[PDB]
Amino acid sequence: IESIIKTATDTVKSEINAELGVVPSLNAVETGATSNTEPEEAIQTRTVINQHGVSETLVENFLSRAALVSKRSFEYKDHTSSTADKNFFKWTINTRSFVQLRRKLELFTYLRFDAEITILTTVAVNGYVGLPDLTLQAMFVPTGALTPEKQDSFHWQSGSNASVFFKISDPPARITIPFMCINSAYSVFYDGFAGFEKNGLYGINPADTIGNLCVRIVNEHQPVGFTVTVRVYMKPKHIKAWAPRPPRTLPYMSIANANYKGKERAPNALSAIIGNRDSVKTMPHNIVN
Amino acid sequence: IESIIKTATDTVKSEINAELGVVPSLNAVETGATSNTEPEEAIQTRTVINQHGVSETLVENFLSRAALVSKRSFEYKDHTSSTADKNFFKWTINTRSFVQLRRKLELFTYLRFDAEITILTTVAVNGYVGLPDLTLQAMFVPTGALTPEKQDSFHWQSGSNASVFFKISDPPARITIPFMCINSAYSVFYDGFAGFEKNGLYGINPADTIGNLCVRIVNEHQPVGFTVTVRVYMKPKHIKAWAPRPPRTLPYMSIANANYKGKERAPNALSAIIGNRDSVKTMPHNIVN
Amino acid sequence: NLIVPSESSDTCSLIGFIAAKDDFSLRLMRDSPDIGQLDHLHAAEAAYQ
Amino acid sequence: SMMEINNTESAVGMERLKVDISALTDVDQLLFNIPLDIQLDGPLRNTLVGNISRYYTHWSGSLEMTFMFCGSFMAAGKLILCYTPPGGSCPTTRETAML
Amino acid sequence: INFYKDSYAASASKQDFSQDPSKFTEPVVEGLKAGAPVL
Amino acid sequence: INFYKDSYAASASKQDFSQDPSKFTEPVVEGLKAGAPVL
Amino acid sequence: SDRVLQLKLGNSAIVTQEAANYCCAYGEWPNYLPDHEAVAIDKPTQPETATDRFYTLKSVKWETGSTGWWWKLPDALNNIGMFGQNVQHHYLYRSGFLIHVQCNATKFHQGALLVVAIPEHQRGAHNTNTSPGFDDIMKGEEGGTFNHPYVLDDGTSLACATIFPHQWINLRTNNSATIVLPWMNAAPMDFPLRHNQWTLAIIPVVPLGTRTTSSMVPITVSIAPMCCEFNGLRHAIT
Amino acid sequence: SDRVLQLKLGNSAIVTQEAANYCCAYGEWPNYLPDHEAVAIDKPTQPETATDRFYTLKSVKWETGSTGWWWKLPDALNNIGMFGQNVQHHYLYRSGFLIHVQCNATKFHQGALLVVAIPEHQRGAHNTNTSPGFDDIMKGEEGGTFNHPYVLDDGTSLACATIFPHQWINLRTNNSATIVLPWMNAAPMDFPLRHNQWTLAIIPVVPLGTRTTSSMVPITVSIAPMCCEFNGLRHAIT
Ligand SMILES: CC(C)Oc1ccc(CNc2cccc3c(-c4ccc(C#N)nc4)ccnc23)cc1
Ligand SMILES: CC(C)Oc1ccc(CNc2cccc3c(-c4ccc(C#N)nc4)ccnc23)cc1
């Protein structure tokens, strides 16, 4: 039954049991149900009024904290002779690059949420003059819009694209992107192929495509070079989640897929996820006095 | 009929049709009316309760986002020997210079709105010393007012002109200009001549003249030179729009006119706006498996 | 078949039109790829002179 | 608004806005097709629905195509216009398209 | 939030959901019918 | 505090205390009993 | 009483005398798409008993070395009977499934099968950066075999797969498993040739053992689509 | 007003601007089989819009020497679309038909087609004692041509064929004919591969004539099954 649960369940006192035909510790795992054996059935209990709150395990609280999704460093310099991110970069938006957020999200099959984005920028002098207070432009370039080819291309005039202009001395730039799947939920996993032909990508729902984040320095280059690093954080909010999954055990290999190899030896080897003990009779950290 | 529309229309279920004298898929384009054939008339439909909102295609939302209208770079230096924008510039206000805003606005014949203006300033050291925190003055100089001739001319004392003084380390300077046409709407297109004689300009309604934006650095020059770039953004708000138009296909040539040449070859050549396919029987991206 | 008499033109034309119906909806505004510029336009520099 | 269905070389200017139909001596022949990809540069792109929709990334809802016959009063004929939901190739024979 | 004295200073008015597409789709003096042929 | 016009701009919704773990722990068509053996 | 079950759908019936209840995934039951959730506006075909019936796949042999088996839905059924003909002629499909898995042996045999329905079972490849190809994923009626059932071929784990809708076949206890699957997708309908909603997985966590004379011990899979809808009638892709 | 007609069935529509009313055979309309007339007790499949739609056959050329054409129902449709797949998978079938026959020419052309639906059109052979063979009768989508339309290939007469449900196409007057056929059988259902309920016949009683430049003048046949039911699901005969 669906019910409102704010605290852990109370324990009732229980007596001795000796009833024929009543056998609450016996179960049948083959049904696929979990054991319904209560502690009051397994042992004699006392009454316990339980006050422990359950708010910290809410899916909202579990997922709605800001995580790094993108980090890029580029040279802020005169690029006339470079081969390179020439005072700007383009990022194809994804959540698979940083394993801590990736593993948390992949505990679920379908997710619906809005994304709070924070952009943190940092600058160092290339191998000192002090640090300049640069202006940056982040521009969202949706599917089928033209991405900028140059720091000063006219794409940056941004007539209809969302842009945010922000300083390095400011607090980190912050915006919310709405839930923008063409379905009612994002497909965290996708057992399918993106195209009507056979050559399309496995494992990525086309319905979930966000677009590109294009970031430039707005200033003309200075006489000396700098490295600029941009960090993007995403925080899910107003979250719905469906069909929880076995967590990732093996190290990730790629952002394109669930391909797996494991560590050379346990823990998280393909052959052994838990580290070995000497025998099933060995207690590894046994208390001895 | 004028009505309040917030969501797309619902679909009703439809049955088989076989009525003499009733022929809803036939039409007459020569009246100038668009086809009134409904889907329930053309095929058997199911009932669909349609929830899709129409708010993002509101003319307010379509136009009311900030677009670059003016960008100017000048040298901040000792100009005693220069030929040049000598620590200040004057801009004759127009919307025709940046094609993304220009094309959006030109989807309409008449527009009435207020303009939110944002001024973003950036500085680089000329070919490093760090970047100075300069004070700038933007002064609106209406029609028939005197424009400044020098960085320190007395015109800048601004007894009755609107001026805004702003720092480079500040957030971008922001003001609203009211809707200020001497008519009830701006003329986005004007099939006329500005003067009572024949030599006046074609294509610009005199009623729409805004004036000049004059921008100086307020500081005395430093011992070293800098480049300052000023970017002006305009956001229409409180918008009314009348008589939508065929969009611009050919690349713009000039800010003075609608003159057209096209690209050398399709797309958007004068002779061919859509790129060619091999025949009217060729399906260019045909699915083959 | 297209069937015509001798004094009609032997070849005839269709014009095709398209529109959205009132169930049509659009989402997620972007810059249109139908327009661009490489240089400044003519007389744009002159607005500063 | 008019589709540029005849987006072929040697159609010049206004000629790209009309499709010419001739009498045939073989039954049930294909006359033309129309690609429906509004994002790519096809007959639908330079239309009112086309040019406005390309400021946006997502779309939903029905499209109407209307064809005006511009032969003489004495011209007669019957055509079949077919929409094929996606999944396979564009049909090349009437017995396939009429499904 | 608007503490300015001029009402043109305000934020944008995104609530005008009135449409009349028939002035562009059906400017015919005799309105079209569904149950009858146009001409 | 939310002065933005779109409701998706809001702060997070941490008040949804509804649970139904039985859809994951007991998706059996005949519900289990305490006082009777499972099979 | 919870050990005997009859499932009747269309012209097909299954009886079992040794069930262990049955699973309704997430407590759901299959339903047709309601009007407040519909997208496609053409009137759907609903073939009922022509599609909503048990199809029995080719049986597989449970051997001492068996790693387990999988079949993807709708792919495994896309070429079978009137269900296959409707998927071939229609762009869009929606249905549930009733899955019945069958494996009898003697009272001197032992062994346990995990029978689990996995939503969006996006496979990984082993020890490569290249994503699984089309022919690795799309197997049809034959289905595939597990490469590494211990990570479910996806770098996760078998031990936690009981979070998905499942039963067991424990040869001591029961000879069949039943799982009822609702429609499980983020969209209300899908193109059946390029996305699989469900993977059936059968994994021998305890191997088959006996000391009587060996016999072939097959595992048999019967799947009935439930509440089939199809939209976007055209020619057959086929 | 009786000259313009739109017929809409499923995803298909036909408009005509030059009809001559339309015929409802014997004043009937197609209906599904009621319970008080049913024989077969399995629940029927009723595919609706997947089957109940216009199928357009290959057009035939009207020439000065043409004797006329015929198509048998259900045979001409037994291999077309989801109608054909259901007849192939089911022992029993029932439906009506809506038949639309199309033939335009110029105002300088003349000619008249008798368009007639003949129930139980059991053919004769000419000048032999041997009965017509299977390949003489079963023609599929192509249909056949008349050997002797003056006796309707059955030793009766063309002059009296107006007792059957018919219209005319008189090129002076109209360019299309429409006939709605009920279920017309002594049994409530039939096996569609061995009995044809209806023969469509198109006979040029007045030959095509003009003195303008000649063009090919095709005749086109579109047939929509109406209220399709199928019983006795099994494998496809096909
Ligand atoms: C430049 C400014 C004005 O616009 C911007 C700024 C930044 C961004 C970057 N956003 C984003 C970065 C990374 C992920 C997302 C997602 C997302 C997350 C998880 C899942 C799952 N499972 N699916 C989708 C949704 C929306 N956004 C995202 C986009 C637009
Ligand atoms: C220095 C401060 C205090 O004052 C300032 C600051 C900046 C400005 C620059 N404004 C402006 C720049 C560009 C355009 C406009 C328009 C306008 C837009 C579109 C159409 C059309 N179709 N028609 C008129 C109206 C008012 N303004 C404008 C003017 C005065």
PDB file of C-alpha atoms in Angstrom, chain B residues 26-229:
ATOM      1  CA  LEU B  26     -11.595  19.433 -51.899  1.00  0.00           C
ATOM      2  CA  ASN B  27     -10.619  23.107 -51.677  1.00  0.00           C
ATOM      3  CA  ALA B  28     -10.283  26.272 -53.763  1.00  0.00           C
ATOM      4  CA  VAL B  29      -6.861  27.936 -53.370  1.00  0.00           C
ATOM      5  CA  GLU B  30      -7.964  30.766 -55.719  1.00  0.00           C
ATOM      6  CA  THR B  31     -10.101  32.363 -52.986  1.00  0.00           C
ATOM      7  CA  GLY B  32      -6.895  33.054 -51.059  1.00  0.00           C
ATOM      8  CA  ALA B  33      -8.165  31.109 -48.060  1.00  0.00           C
ATOM      9  CA  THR B  34      -6.061  28.294 -46.648  1.00  0.00           C
ATOM     10  CA  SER B  35      -7.463  24.746 -46.620  1.00  0.00           C
ATOM     11  CA  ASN B  36     -10.048  24.103 -43.906  1.00  0.00           C
ATOM     12  CA  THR B  37      -9.778  20.265 -44.220  1.00  0.00           C
ATOM     13  CA  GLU B  38      -9.504  18.735 -40.794  1.00  0.00           C
ATOM     14  CA  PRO B  39      -7.711  15.451 -39.979  1.00  0.00           C
ATOM     15  CA  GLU B  40     -11.019  13.966 -38.728  1.00  0.00           C
ATOM     16  CA  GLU B  41     -12.287  14.555 -42.284  1.00  0.00           C
ATOM     17  CA  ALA B  42      -9.239  13.127 -44.104  1.00  0.00           C
ATOM     18  CA  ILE B  43      -8.649   9.898 -42.085  1.00  0.00           C
ATOM     19  CA  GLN B  44     -10.208   7.939 -39.240  1.00  0.00           C
ATOM     20  CA  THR B  45      -8.814   9.454 -36.013  1.00  0.00           C
ATOM     21  CA  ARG B  46      -8.747   8.498 -32.360  1.00  0.00           C
ATOM     22  CA  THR B  47      -9.589  10.845 -29.509  1.00  0.00           C
ATOM     23  CA  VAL B  48      -6.449  12.652 -28.265  1.00  0.00           C
ATOM     24  CA  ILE B  49      -6.482  15.054 -25.306  1.00  0.00           C
ATOM     25  CA  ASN B  50      -3.725  17.472 -26.306  1.00  0.00           C
ATOM     26  CA  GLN B  51      -1.746  19.146 -23.511  1.00  0.00           C
ATOM     27  CA  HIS B  52       1.011  20.872 -25.569  1.00  0.00           C
ATOM     28  CA  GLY B  53       1.381  24.527 -24.568  1.00  0.00           C
ATOM     29  CA  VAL B  54       1.725  27.317 -27.136  1.00  0.00           C
ATOM     30  CA  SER B  55       3.524  29.894 -24.931  1.00  0.00           C
ATOM     31  CA  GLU B  56       6.949  29.671 -26.557  1.00  0.00           C
ATOM     32  CA  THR B  57       5.625  30.923 -29.924  1.00  0.00           C
ATOM     33  CA  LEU B  58       4.108  34.074 -28.384  1.00  0.00           C
ATOM     34  CA  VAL B  59       5.370  37.130 -30.261  1.00  0.00           C
ATOM     35  CA  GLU B  60       6.539  38.489 -26.891  1.00  0.00           C
ATOM     36  CA  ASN B  61       8.683  35.405 -26.264  1.00  0.00           C
ATOM     37  CA  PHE B  62       9.772  35.097 -29.897  1.00  0.00           C
ATOM     38  CA  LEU B  63      11.167  38.647 -30.000  1.00  0.00           C
ATOM     39  CA  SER B  64      11.887  39.617 -26.348  1.00  0.00           C
ATOM     40  CA  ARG B  65      15.421  38.321 -26.004  1.00  0.00           C
ATOM     41  CA  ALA B  66      18.555  40.480 -25.969  1.00  0.00           C
ATOM     42  CA  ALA B  67      20.403  40.757 -29.300  1.00  0.00           C
ATOM     43  CA  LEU B  68      23.617  42.552 -30.249  1.00  0.00           C
ATOM     44  CA  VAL B  69      22.865  45.747 -32.201  1.00  0.00           C
ATOM     45  CA  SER B  70      26.204  47.620 -32.036  1.00  0.00           C
ATOM     46  CA  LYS B  71      29.848  46.610 -31.513  1.00  0.00           C
ATOM     47  CA  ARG B  72      32.708  49.142 -31.568  1.00  0.00           C
ATOM     48  CA  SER B  73      36.424  48.891 -30.725  1.00  0.00           C
ATOM     49  CA  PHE B  74      38.563  51.963 -30.101  1.00  0.00           C
ATOM     50  CA  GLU B  75      42.002  52.772 -28.726  1.00  0.00           C
ATOM     51  CA  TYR B  76      42.263  54.135 -25.208  1.00  0.00           C
ATOM     52  CA  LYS B  77      45.566  56.007 -25.493  1.00  0.00           C
ATOM     53  CA  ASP B  78      47.197  59.411 -25.918  1.00  0.00           C
ATOM     54  CA  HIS B  79      45.682  60.481 -29.262  1.00  0.00           C
ATOM     55  CA  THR B  80      47.549  63.780 -29.805  1.00  0.00           C
ATOM     56  CA  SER B  81      49.163  62.375 -32.984  1.00  0.00           C
ATOM     57  CA  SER B  82      46.407  60.078 -34.265  1.00  0.00           C
ATOM     58  CA  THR B  83      44.582  60.609 -37.563  1.00  0.00           C
ATOM     59  CA  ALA B  84      40.338  57.652 -35.434  1.00  0.00           C
ATOM     60  CA  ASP B  85      38.073  57.198 -32.403  1.00  0.00           C
ATOM     61  CA  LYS B  86      40.070  59.323 -29.953  1.00  0.00           C
ATOM     62  CA  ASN B  87      38.934  57.806 -26.616  1.00  0.00           C
ATOM     63  CA  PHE B  88      35.244  58.051 -27.614  1.00  0.00           C
ATOM     64  CA  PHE B  89      32.867  57.052 -30.422  1.00  0.00           C
ATOM     65  CA  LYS B  90      29.505  58.165 -31.831  1.00  0.00           C
ATOM     66  CA  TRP B  91      26.990  55.596 -33.177  1.00  0.00           C
ATOM     67  CA  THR B  92      23.979  56.482 -35.320  1.00  0.00           C
ATOM     68  CA  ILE B  93      21.398  54.117 -33.805  1.00  0.00           C
ATOM     69  CA  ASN B  94      20.034  51.414 -36.149  1.00  0.00           C
ATOM     70  CA  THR B  95      18.855  47.785 -36.050  1.00  0.00           C
ATOM     71  CA  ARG B  96      20.012  46.727 -39.549  1.00  0.00           C
ATOM     72  CA  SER B  97      23.668  45.900 -38.800  1.00  0.00           C
ATOM     73  CA  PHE B  98      23.416  42.404 -37.254  1.00  0.00           C
ATOM     74  CA  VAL B  99      21.510  39.939 -39.411  1.00  0.00           C
ATOM     75  CA  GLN B 100      20.043  37.633 -36.738  1.00  0.00           C
ATOM     76  CA  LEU B 101      18.037  40.393 -35.047  1.00  0.00           C
ATOM     77  CA  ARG B 102      17.406  42.108 -38.388  1.00  0.00           C
ATOM     78  CA  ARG B 103      15.811  39.009 -39.945  1.00  0.00           C
ATOM     79  CA  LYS B 104      13.657  38.354 -36.853  1.00  0.00           C
ATOM     80  CA  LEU B 105      12.356  41.939 -36.760  1.00  0.00           C
ATOM     81  CA  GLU B 106      11.714  41.948 -40.518  1.00  0.00           C
ATOM     82  CA  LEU B 107       9.219  39.113 -40.168  1.00  0.00           C
ATOM     83  CA  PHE B 108       6.799  41.972 -39.295  1.00  0.00           C
ATOM     84  CA  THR B 109       5.703  45.217 -40.991  1.00  0.00           C
ATOM     85  CA  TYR B 110       4.879  47.276 -37.896  1.00  0.00           C
ATOM     86  CA  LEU B 111       6.273  46.847 -34.390  1.00  0.00           C
ATOM     87  CA  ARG B 112       5.565  48.742 -31.164  1.00  0.00           C
ATOM     88  CA  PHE B 113       7.804  47.999 -28.177  1.00  0.00           C
ATOM     89  CA  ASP B 114      10.080  49.394 -25.471  1.00  0.00           C
ATOM     90  CA  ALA B 115      13.822  48.632 -25.748  1.00  0.00           C
ATOM     91  CA  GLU B 116      15.879  47.220 -22.865  1.00  0.00           C
ATOM     92  CA  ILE B 117      19.531  48.151 -23.555  1.00  0.00           C
ATOM     93  CA  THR B 118      22.521  46.337 -22.030  1.00  0.00           C
ATOM     94  CA  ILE B 119      26.053  47.743 -22.486  1.00  0.00           C
ATOM     95  CA  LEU B 120      28.915  45.243 -22.142  1.00  0.00           C
ATOM     96  CA  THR B 121      32.484  46.570 -22.122  1.00  0.00           C
ATOM     97  CA  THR B 122      35.774  44.701 -22.457  1.00  0.00           C
ATOM     98  CA  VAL B 123      39.399  45.871 -22.436  1.00  0.00           C
ATOM     99  CA  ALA B 124      42.720  44.426 -23.614  1.00  0.00           C
ATOM    100  CA  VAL B 125      46.279  45.719 -23.329  1.00  0.00           C
ATOM    101  CA  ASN B 126      47.699  46.818 -26.668  1.00  0.00           C
ATOM    102  CA  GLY B 127      50.716  44.884 -27.895  1.00  0.00           C
ATOM    103  CA  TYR B 128      50.969  43.274 -20.413  1.00  0.00           C
ATOM    104  CA  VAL B 129      50.232  45.397 -17.344  1.00  0.00           C
ATOM    105  CA  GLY B 130      46.920  44.142 -16.019  1.00  0.00           C
ATOM    106  CA  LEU B 131      43.579  45.607 -16.982  1.00  0.00           C
ATOM    107  CA  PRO B 132      42.387  48.997 -15.678  1.00  0.00           C
ATOM    108  CA  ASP B 133      38.956  49.544 -14.119  1.00  0.00           C
ATOM    109  CA  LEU B 134      37.816  52.404 -16.356  1.00  0.00           C
ATOM    110  CA  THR B 135      34.741  54.596 -15.993  1.00  0.00           C
ATOM    111  CA  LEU B 136      32.701  55.041 -19.184  1.00  0.00           C
ATOM    112  CA  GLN B 137      29.931  57.498 -20.065  1.00  0.00           C
ATOM    113  CA  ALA B 138      27.171  56.627 -22.530  1.00  0.00           C
ATOM    114  CA  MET B 139      25.128  59.679 -23.576  1.00  0.00           C
ATOM    115  CA  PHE B 140      21.937  59.567 -25.659  1.00  0.00           C
ATOM    116  CA  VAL B 141      22.013  62.480 -28.121  1.00  0.00           C
ATOM    117  CA  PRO B 142      18.562  62.845 -29.739  1.00  0.00           C
ATOM    118  CA  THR B 143      17.827  64.329 -33.153  1.00  0.00           C
ATOM    119  CA  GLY B 144      19.058  67.908 -33.451  1.00  0.00           C
ATOM    120  CA  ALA B 145      21.130  67.858 -30.269  1.00  0.00           C
ATOM    121  CA  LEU B 146      24.860  68.527 -30.575  1.00  0.00           C
ATOM    122  CA  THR B 147      27.173  65.498 -30.548  1.00  0.00           C
ATOM    123  CA  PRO B 148      30.532  65.651 -28.732  1.00  0.00           C
ATOM    124  CA  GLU B 149      33.550  66.416 -30.907  1.00  0.00           C
ATOM    125  CA  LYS B 150      36.189  65.476 -28.276  1.00  0.00           C
ATOM    126  CA  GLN B 151      36.619  63.228 -25.256  1.00  0.00           C
ATOM    127  CA  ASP B 152      36.644  66.312 -23.002  1.00  0.00           C
ATOM    128  CA  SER B 153      34.308  68.652 -24.879  1.00  0.00           C
ATOM    129  CA  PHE B 154      31.682  70.337 -22.708  1.00  0.00           C
ATOM    130  CA  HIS B 155      28.872  68.442 -24.485  1.00  0.00           C
ATOM    131  CA  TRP B 156      29.587  65.643 -21.973  1.00  0.00           C
ATOM    132  CA  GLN B 157      28.417  67.871 -19.096  1.00  0.00           C
ATOM    133  CA  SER B 158      24.997  66.437 -20.076  1.00  0.00           C
ATOM    134  CA  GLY B 159      22.642  68.983 -18.518  1.00  0.00           C
ATOM    135  CA  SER B 160      19.551  67.534 -20.235  1.00  0.00           C
ATOM    136  CA  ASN B 161      20.760  64.478 -22.168  1.00  0.00           C
ATOM    137  CA  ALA B 162      20.383  61.100 -20.500  1.00  0.00           C
ATOM    138  CA  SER B 163      23.820  59.777 -19.556  1.00  0.00           C
ATOM    139  CA  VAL B 164      24.802  56.594 -17.764  1.00  0.00           C
ATOM    140  CA  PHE B 165      28.197  56.335 -16.040  1.00  0.00           C
ATOM    141  CA  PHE B 166      29.453  52.792 -15.510  1.00  0.00           C
ATOM    142  CA  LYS B 167      32.587  50.848 -14.569  1.00  0.00           C
ATOM    143  CA  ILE B 168      34.185  47.943 -16.414  1.00  0.00           C
ATOM    144  CA  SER B 169      34.231  45.867 -13.202  1.00  0.00           C
ATOM    145  CA  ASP B 170      30.476  46.451 -12.733  1.00  0.00           C
ATOM    146  CA  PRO B 171      27.810  44.236 -14.256  1.00  0.00           C
ATOM    147  CA  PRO B 172      26.783  45.483 -17.718  1.00  0.00           C
ATOM    148  CA  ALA B 173      24.955  48.820 -17.667  1.00  0.00           C
ATOM    149  CA  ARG B 174      21.194  48.487 -18.275  1.00  0.00           C
ATOM    150  CA  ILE B 175      18.454  51.002 -19.183  1.00  0.00           C
ATOM    151  CA  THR B 176      15.025  50.921 -20.846  1.00  0.00           C
ATOM    152  CA  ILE B 177      14.224  53.318 -23.684  1.00  0.00           C
ATOM    153  CA  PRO B 178      10.467  53.845 -24.140  1.00  0.00           C
ATOM    154  CA  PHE B 179       8.705  53.268 -27.436  1.00  0.00           C
ATOM    155  CA  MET B 180       9.548  56.604 -29.021  1.00  0.00           C
ATOM    156  CA  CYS B 181       8.242  56.655 -32.604  1.00  0.00           C
ATOM    157  CA  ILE B 182       6.171  59.715 -33.526  1.00  0.00           C
ATOM    158  CA  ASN B 183       3.742  57.148 -34.952  1.00  0.00           C
ATOM    159  CA  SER B 184       1.870  54.454 -33.058  1.00  0.00           C
ATOM    160  CA  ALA B 185       4.289  51.820 -34.426  1.00  0.00           C
ATOM    161  CA  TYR B 186       7.756  51.609 -35.914  1.00  0.00           C
ATOM    162  CA  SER B 187       7.850  51.047 -39.669  1.00  0.00           C
ATOM    163  CA  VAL B 188      10.061  47.985 -40.088  1.00  0.00           C
ATOM    164  CA  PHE B 189       9.673  48.488 -43.855  1.00  0.00           C
ATOM    165  CA  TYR B 190       9.022  51.817 -45.531  1.00  0.00           C
ATOM    166  CA  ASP B 191       8.004  52.116 -49.182  1.00  0.00           C
ATOM    167  CA  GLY B 192       8.733  55.813 -49.332  1.00  0.00           C
ATOM    168  CA  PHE B 193      11.162  58.709 -49.440  1.00  0.00           C
ATOM    169  CA  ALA B 194      12.251  60.641 -46.362  1.00  0.00           C
ATOM    170  CA  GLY B 195      12.038  64.184 -47.777  1.00  0.00           C
ATOM    171  CA  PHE B 196       9.766  66.545 -49.674  1.00  0.00           C
ATOM    172  CA  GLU B 197      12.341  66.669 -52.468  1.00  0.00           C
ATOM    173  CA  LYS B 198      13.215  63.686 -54.657  1.00  0.00           C
ATOM    174  CA  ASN B 199      16.815  63.251 -53.443  1.00  0.00           C
ATOM    175  CA  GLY B 200      15.920  61.997 -49.946  1.00  0.00           C
ATOM    176  CA  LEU B 201      16.602  58.457 -48.751  1.00  0.00           C
ATOM    177  CA  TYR B 202      14.409  55.586 -49.855  1.00  0.00           C
ATOM    178  CA  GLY B 203      13.380  52.908 -47.383  1.00  0.00           C
ATOM    179  CA  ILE B 204      13.694  54.669 -43.980  1.00  0.00           C
ATOM    180  CA  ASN B 205      10.705  56.200 -42.233  1.00  0.00           C
ATOM    181  CA  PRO B 206      11.791  59.567 -40.718  1.00  0.00           C
ATOM    182  CA  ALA B 207       9.249  58.863 -37.970  1.00  0.00           C
ATOM    183  CA  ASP B 208      11.514  56.098 -36.582  1.00  0.00           C
ATOM    184  CA  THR B 209      14.706  58.153 -35.954  1.00  0.00           C
ATOM    185  CA  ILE B 210      16.159  57.444 -32.500  1.00  0.00           C
ATOM    186  CA  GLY B 211      19.346  59.548 -32.451  1.00  0.00           C
ATOM    187  CA  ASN B 212      22.983  58.986 -31.472  1.00  0.00           C
ATOM    188  CA  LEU B 213      24.712  56.969 -28.791  1.00  0.00           C
ATOM    189  CA  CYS B 214      27.958  58.696 -27.775  1.00  0.00           C
ATOM    190  CA  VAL B 215      30.341  56.699 -25.573  1.00  0.00           C
ATOM    191  CA  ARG B 216      33.581  57.948 -24.022  1.00  0.00           C
ATOM    192  CA  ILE B 217      36.102  56.778 -21.518  1.00  0.00           C
ATOM    193  CA  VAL B 218      35.944  59.295 -18.685  1.00  0.00           C
ATOM    194  CA  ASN B 219      39.516  58.711 -17.449  1.00  0.00           C
ATOM    195  CA  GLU B 220      42.475  60.630 -18.773  1.00  0.00           C
ATOM    196  CA  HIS B 221      44.655  58.446 -20.964  1.00  0.00           C
ATOM    197  CA  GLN B 222      47.217  56.205 -19.257  1.00  0.00           C
ATOM    198  CA  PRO B 223      50.918  55.967 -20.180  1.00  0.00           C
ATOM    199  CA  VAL B 224      50.149  52.788 -22.196  1.00  0.00           C
ATOM    200  CA  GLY B 225      47.435  52.051 -24.734  1.00  0.00           C
ATOM    201  CA  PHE B 226      44.386  49.808 -24.481  1.00  0.00           C
ATOM    202  CA  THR B 227      41.698  48.595 -26.847  1.00  0.00           C
ATOM    203  CA  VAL B 228      38.164  49.024 -25.496  1.00  0.00           C
ATOM    204  CA  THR B 229      35.267  47.165 -27.136  1.00  0.00           C
TER     205      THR B 229
END
